[PDB]
Design a protein around this nucleic acid. Structure first.
Lengths: 127, 60, 100, 151, 206, 79, 98, 114
RNA sequence: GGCCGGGAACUCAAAGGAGACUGCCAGUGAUAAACUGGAGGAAGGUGGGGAUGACGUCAAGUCAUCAUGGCCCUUACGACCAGGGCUACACACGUGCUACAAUGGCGCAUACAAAGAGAAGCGACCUCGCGAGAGCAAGCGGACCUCAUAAAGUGCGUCGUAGUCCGGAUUGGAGUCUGCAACUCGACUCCAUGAAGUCGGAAUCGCUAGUAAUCGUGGAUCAGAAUGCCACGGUGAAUACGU
C-alpha cells in the first residue's frame, strides 16, 4: 500500500515505494520501454516476482540514483526485497531461500601500496 | 560610500553595537550591494568573523 | 643540503618581495591586448634592469631547516621526512596515521 | 586445490529464462568485462540459428554440443622419470564447459565479415560434426587413442 | 628497516597529541615556524630541568606551551622571575603572547624521557652502561610500571664495530594498540662519536 | 611559439644593432645571450655568439624573423 | 539566519563544544535550531620514508578535518552577549557569522 | 576520375575520395564537399563530371600533391641553405626534437639491422 | 530550476553504541579438541580489506634529509654571478603507454559515479575564433560557488578483411597558454603526412572476485610542464579434476 524498502547496490542509493492495484513500471519519471525497455536485464527490475502476480496487480514508482547502470539495475531488485513487507509472511521466507534480501558486498577493493590495481603485482622475473 | 561605508579588504574597523561593541577587527570581505561588512573580532583569541553594518562599526 | 643554497633563498625571498610580490601591473598586465607600438615593448625594457632572480619563476619551495630541493609538499612547507618528523612526535595537530 | 578443496560459485543465469546452462557460454564468450555488448551479439547469434533451423532454442543448441562432447582428453601424470600423456575420462559434468572453449576460439579464427558472422557459420558447422572446431577435437582423440594404456 | 613507533600509531586514541590547534593551509606555516625553534631554545636551557613532554597548543591569535617537568624549582629558579625570561624571549619572536604552562609530574623516574637522558647524562664519563641502566630499570620496575624494554646505541665500550642490545622486563605492546607504553630518544655527542638511546616503558591498559 | 604579442631581445643586443648601422664592418661582435632573437633590422651582422666555451660566428639572412641565434651558435659536440 | 560554524579536526573534542554552546544559549536566549553537521573531511598523503632510495615505502598519514554548524534561529541580544568572548573548546576556530 | 591529375576516387565514399589526395586532411576534406553541397555518404557512381569541374575550382585555391611536394622540399632546402642546427640535424639521420632519442628514436635511425 | 511553502516519514550527513561467539541442532570422532552441513540474520566461520613487519640474516643501502669521530681544503676542494649540460647516440636491457580494427574508426540522439583540490588563485554567463582559447566578469578563502559537458554503453545507420575510412610516429607550416626567457629546451590545439606492424620463437610476468579485464577522472608537485604515481568510479569472467 504505502510501505518502504531500501537497496544500496554498489554506491547507488535508492528510494523504493510499493503501490498495489494499478500496473505500470516507472523508474524515476521514466517509462518502461523508453529508458530501459531495450537495455539488457529488464527482467532484473522484476526478477523475484514470478511466483507472485504483480504485472497486472502491482505498480512500482522507483527512484534510484548514484553508482552505475547495473548498480541502479541491481538496487531495484535489492530495494524491492526490503519492500516486499506487506505480504512479507508469504515473501520473507522465500527471499532468503532465494537469497534475494542479501546485500552482496562485492565492494571496492582499496589500492594497497605497490599492488597496482590493489592486487596486481608488477612483473618480476628471476633477475 | 564614505570611510566605514567604503570598507576595504584587510582594513581595520571598530564595533560599537551589539555584544561585539568595544571591539576592533579587520574586514576580510565587503558587500556594498548587501550593505554589510565581513569583519571578525578577536574574542577569546579566535577571530570571530561577524557581519556588521557601516554604521554598526567605525572605520579604523 | 648546504648552507649556501639556504643562503640563496633568503636572498631570493628578499628582492622578489621588493618588486614581484606587490608590483604586478608592470610585470603582467602592461603587455595585454593593446596597440603593438613599442611603448609596451618599452615597458618590458624596464623589466631588464631589475634582477632576474627577483621573478616568481625563481621560487623554489625549500625545507626551512635543511633546504632539500626535491620531494617537497606545500601543505606543511616541509621536506618529505619532516612530515614524519612531526607525525611520530606529534608536532602537528590532527596528523594521524591513515589506518584505512 | 592443495587442501582447501573449493567448488565453483554460481553462474549468473540467462535473463530471458532461468537457465544456468546457457550462462556458462555467455561468460567465456564475453571478453574484457563487457557483458552488455557481448550478450546482444550472442543473442543475435541465437537469431542466426533459430531461423536457419527453426526447431527450438534450448534443444537446437544442445544437439550442437552433445554430439561434440569429448569422452576423454590428455594430461600429464607422474609414474616414473619423464613426460607421459595419460587418457583421462572426463565427467559428463566436465565435458560441457571444456567443449565451449574449442568453440569460442572458433569465433576468433576464420574471420568471415564480422564477429556476429565470424561466430555464426562456426557455430553452424558444429551441429553436424564436420566443422573445423570439431576437427581439432578428434585429432586429440587421434592422440588419445594412440596411447590407451591405463585401466 | 624495522621498529615503528607505538607512539605515532596510538596518539589520540589513548594518548593526547603533542600539538592541538586549528590552522588553515595558508597559516600552517607561521604556526609551525614558532614551534620548532623555541622548543630548540627550550631544550637548550631546560635540558637539565628534567622535562617529559612539551605540548604546544596555540589557538587562533594565541599560544600556550604545556611544559611537563618534575623539578620546576630550577625552572622558576627563584620567585618565578625566570619564567618570564622564558616569556620575554618568545613574545617578540612569534609576535603573539605565549603563555607558559609548567604542569609538573609528581613522579620523575617513571618517564620515558628521563631514563633516556639518564644514561646520557652519565655517558660522557665512561660508565659500565649495564649497571647504569639496571639501576634505573629496576627502580622503574619496582615502582609500578609493569613492563620495560630499554635500549642503548653507538659504539658501547669504546668499541668500533656495530653493537646494540636490549634488556627485557615485563610486557611490551607493539601489536596491541590498546595498552599504554611510551618511548623517547636523545643523543650524546662527544670526543668519541654519538652514543644513543631508546626506551620502551610500559604503564598499563584501559 | 612563445607569443604573437612579442618576442624578446636584450637591451645590450638592442644597441649593438643601432651602433651597427652608423659605423660598420670593423670586427666580429661579441654576445652572451643565445636566447635573443633576430629582427629584420640586423642584416649582414657578423655576430660571434657564446656557446659556453667560445663564440661562434653567425651571418644573418632575412628568413630569420622568428628565429634565434642558437640555431646558428650550437653547443653539442659529437666526435 | 545567524550562523555559528565551528572548525576543527576531531569529533572527540568538538563533542563537548556542541554541548557547551547550545545550553549556555538556552539559559540566556533559548533560541536555537540545533546542531546540523557537515561531512567529515579527509586529507590523506602518501610520503616516501627511505632517505635516498626505494620508491616503495609510502606510509599513509592524514590530517583529519571536521565541521559542525550550530545555527541559532533568532539574533538574540543575550545569547551573543553572554557567549561573545567565551568558547570552551581550546585550539579551535570559531566562526560566529552574525 | 580526374582529380589533381592522376589521383583517383577508388569506388568509395566521396568523403574519402578527397582525403586520398596529397595535400589535404581532416577538416578541409569535409569543407570541400560541403562547399560543393553534396552529401558525404555518396559514391563516385553518383558523383558525375558536372560537379568535378565545380570541384576543380574549389581545389584551385590551395596547394596540391606535386605542388606541396616542392615547397616542403624548398623549405628544408632553405633549412639546408641555413646550414644551421636544424640545418645539420636532418641529414644526419637523427630526430630533431626535444626527443628522448637515446633509445626510442627509430624513425630516423631505422631498423636495428647492423 | 526541490524553485517558493510544507514535512521529521525517507535517502543522505555525522556521532555513542547495539550486531558474531562455533551461541544452537545432528552425524562422526578418544565424555575433549574439531571439520563441516541445518537454522535465522546485514553478514558464518580471522564477515571483505587495511594498519601493526617477533628473535634475527644479508657486519644488505644511504655521510647526498639531519647528526657526528678522524681526514684534508680553509687566497681553496669554500663563495658569487652570466651560458651549456643533466634533455647528449651505432647499439642493449627494464618498467610503463599506443595500435596491430568491425566486440571497430566515425557523426548525431541519449544514460549513469565517488573521492577531493581551491585566493599575489580555482573560474559561472556573455561576444567572437574551424578549433585551442583571448578579452570581460558573478560567485567562492568552500555539501551553497567553480573546477566539472565523465567515457566506454545504448539507437539509427554507415563501410566489408584491405596495411586498410585500421594506427599514430615522423616531419614542414600557422598559432593558443606559462613565464625575464620556449634556439639548444615546454605542453596543447589545429593544418598537412601517414612508414613498422594482421597476435610475435626458446623463455617468462600478473591474478582466486567486483580480483582479471577494459573505459573514464581527480589529486600531490607547481609560473608552465605526466603515457609516471597515489586515489576514485563504470561494466564485468574462466578455472583451482589433483600435490
Amino acid at each position: 500500500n504505502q510501505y518502504y524498502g531500501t537497496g544500496r547496490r554498489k554506491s547507488s542509493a535508492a528510494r523504493v515505494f510499493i503501490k498495489p492495484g494499478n500496473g505500470k513500471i516507472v523508474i524515476n519519471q521514466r517509462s518502461l520501454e523508453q529508458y530501459f525497455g531495450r537495455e539488457t536485464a529488464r527482467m532484473v527490475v522484476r526478477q523475484p516476482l514470478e511466483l507472485v502476480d504483480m504485472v497486472e496487480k502491482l505498480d512500482l514508482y522507483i527512484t534510484v540514483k548514484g553508482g552505475g547502470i547495473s548498480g541502479q539495475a541491481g538496487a531495484i531488485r535489492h530495494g524491492i526485497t526490503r519492500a516486499l513487507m506487506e505480504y512479507d509472511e508469504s515473501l520473507r521466507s522465500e527471499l532468503r531461500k532465494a537469497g534475494f534480501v542479501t546485500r552482496d558486498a562485492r565492494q571496492v577493493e582499496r589500492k594497497k601500496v605497490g599492488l597496482r590495481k590493489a592486487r596486481r603485482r608488477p612483473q618480476f622475473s628471476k633477475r | 560610500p564614505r570611510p566605514k561605508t567604503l570598507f576595504e579588504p584587510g582594513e581595520m574597523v571598530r564595533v560599537n553595537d551589539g555584544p561585539f561593541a568595544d571591539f576592533n577587527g579587520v574586514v576580510e570581505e565587503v558587500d556594498y550591494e548587501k550593505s554589510r561588512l565581513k569583519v571578525s573580532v578577536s574574542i577569546f583569541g579566535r577571530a570571530t568573523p561577524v557581519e556588521l553594518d557601516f554604521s554598526q562599526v567605525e572605520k579604523a | 643540503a648546504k648552507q649556501s643554497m639556504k643562503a640563496r633563498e633568503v636572498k631570493r625571498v628578499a628582492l622578489a618581495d621588493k618588486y614581484f610580490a606587490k608590483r604586478a601591473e608592470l610585470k603582467a598586465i602592461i603587455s595585454d591586448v593593446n596597440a603593438s607600438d613599442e611603448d609596451r615593448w618599452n615597458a618590458v625594457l624596464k623589466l631588464q634592469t631589475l634582477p632576474r632572480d627577483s621573478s616568481p619563476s625563481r621560487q623554489r619551495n625549500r625545507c626551512r631547516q635543511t633546504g632539500r630541493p626535491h620531494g617537497f609538499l606545500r601543505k606543511f612547507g616541509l621536506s618529505r621526512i619532516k612530515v614524519r618528523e612531526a607525525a611520530m612526535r606529534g608536532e602537528i595537530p590532527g596528523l594521524k596515521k591513515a589506518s584505512w | 586445490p592443495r587442501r582447501r578443496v573449493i567448488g565453483q560459485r554460481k553462474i549468473l543465469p540467462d535473463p530471458k529464462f532461468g537457465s544456468e546452462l546457457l550462462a556458462k557460454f555467455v561468460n567465456i564468450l564475453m571478453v574484457d568485462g563487457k557483458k552488455s555488448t557481448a550478450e546482444s551479439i550472442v543473442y543475435s547469434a541465437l537469431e542466426t540459428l533459430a531461423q536457419r533451423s527453426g526447431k527450438s532454442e534450448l534443444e537446437a543448441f544442445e544437439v550442437a554440443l552433445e554430439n561434440v562432447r569429448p569422452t576423454v582428453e590428455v594430461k600429464s601424470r607422474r609414474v616414473g622419470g619423464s613426460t607421459y600423456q595419460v587418457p583421462v575420462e572426463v565427467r559428463p559434468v566436465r565435458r560441457n564447459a571444456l567443449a565451449m572453449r574449442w568453440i569460442v576460439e572458433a569465433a576468433r579464427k576464420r574471420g568471415d565479415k564480422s564477429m556476429a558472422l565470424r561466430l555464426a557459420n562456426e557455430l553452424s558447422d558444429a551441429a553436424e560434426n564436420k566443422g573445423t572446431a570439431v576437427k581439432k577435437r578428434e585429432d586429440v582423440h587421434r592422440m588419445a587413442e594412440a596411447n590407451k594404456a591405463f585401466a | 628497516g624495522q621498529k615503528v613507533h607505538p607512539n605515532g600509531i596510538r596518539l589520540g586514541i589513548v594518548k593526547p597529541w603533542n600539538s592541538t590547534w586549528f590552522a588553515n593551509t595558508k597559516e600552517f606555516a607561521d604556526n609551525l615556524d614558532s614551534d620548532f625553534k623555541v622548543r630548540q631554545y627550550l631544550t637548550k636551557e631546560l635540558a637539565k630541568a628534567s622535562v617529559s613532554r612539551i605540548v604546544i597548543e596555540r589557538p587562533a591569535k594565541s599560544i600556550r606551551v604545556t611544559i611537563h617537568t618534575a623539578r620546576p624549582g630550577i625552572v622558576i629558579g627563584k620567585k618565578g622571575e625566570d619564567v618570564e625570561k622564558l616569556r620575554k624571549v618568545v613574545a617578540d619572536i612569534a609576535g603573539v603572547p605565549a603563555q607558559i604552562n609548567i604542569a609538573e609530574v609528581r613522579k620523575p623516574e617513571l618517564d620515558a624521557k628521563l631514563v633516556a637522558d639518564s644514561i646520557t647524562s652519565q655517558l660522557e664519563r665512561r660508565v659500565m652502561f649495564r649497571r647504569a641502566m639496571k639501576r634505573a630499570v629496576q627502580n622503574a620496575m619496582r615502582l609500578g610500571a609493569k613492563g620495560i624494554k630499554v635500549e642503548v646505541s653507538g659504539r658501547l665500550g669504546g668499541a668500533e664495530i656495530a653493537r646494540t642490545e636490549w634488556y627485557r622486563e615485563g610486557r611490551v605492546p607493539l601489536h596491541t594498540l590498546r595498552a599504554d607504553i611510551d618511548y623517547n630518544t636523545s643523543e650524546a655527542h662527544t670526543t668519541y662519536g654519538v652514543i644513543g638511546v631508546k626506551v620502551w616503558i610500559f604503564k598499563g591498559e584501559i | 611559439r612563445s607569443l604573437k604579442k612579442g618576442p624578446f631581445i636584450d637591451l645590450h643586443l638592442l644597441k649593438k644593432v643601432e651602433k651597427a648601422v652608423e659605423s660598420g664592418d670593423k670586427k666580429p661582435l661579441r654576445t652572451w645571450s643565445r636566447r635573443s632573437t633576430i629582427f629584420p633590422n640586423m642584416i649582414g651582422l657578423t655576430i660571434a655568439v657564446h656557446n659556453g666555451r667560445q663564440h661562434v660566428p653567425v651571418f644573418v639572412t632575412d628568413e630569420m624573423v622568428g628565429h634565434k641565434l642558437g640555431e646558428f651558435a650550437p653547443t653539442r659536440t659529437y666526435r | 539566519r545567524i550562523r555559528i560554524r565551528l572548525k576543527a579536526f576531531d569529533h572527540r573534542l568538538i563533542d563537548q563544544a556542541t554541548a557547551e554552546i547550545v545550553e549556555t544559549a538556552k539559559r540566556t536566549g533559548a533560541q536555537v535550531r540545533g546542531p546540523i553537521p557537515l561531512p567529515t573531511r579527509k586529507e590523506r598523503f602518501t610520503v616516501l620514508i627511505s632517505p635516498h632510495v626505494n620508491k616503495d615505502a609510502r606510509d599513509q598519514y592524514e590530517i583529519r578535518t571536521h565541521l559542525r554548524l550550530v545555527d541559532i534561529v533568532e539574533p538574540t541580544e543575550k545569547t551573543v552577549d553572554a557567549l561573545m568572548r567565551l568558547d570552551l573548546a581550546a585550539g579551535v576556530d570559531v566562526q560566529i557569522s552574525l | 576520375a580526374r582529380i589533381a591529375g592522376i589521383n583517383i576516387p577508388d569506388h568509395k565514399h566521396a568523403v574519402i575520395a578527397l582525403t586520398s589526395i596529397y595535400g589535404v586532411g581532416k577538416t578541409r576534406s569535409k569543407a570541400i564537399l560541403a562547399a560543393a553541397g553534396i552529401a558525404e555518404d555518396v559514391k563516385i557512381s553518383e558523383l558525375s563530371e558536372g560537379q568535378i569541374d565545380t570541384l576543380r575550382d574549389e581545389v584551385a585555391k590551395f596547394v596540391v600533391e606535386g605542388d606541396l611536394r616542392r615547397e616542403i622540399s624548398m623549405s628544408i632546402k632553405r633549412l639546408m641553405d641555413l646550414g644551421c642546427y636544424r640545418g645539420l640535424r636532418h641529414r644526419r639521420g637523427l630526430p630533431v626534437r626535444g626527443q628522448r632519442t637515446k633509445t626510442n628514436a627509430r624513425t630516423r635511425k631505422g631498423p636495428r639491422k647492423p
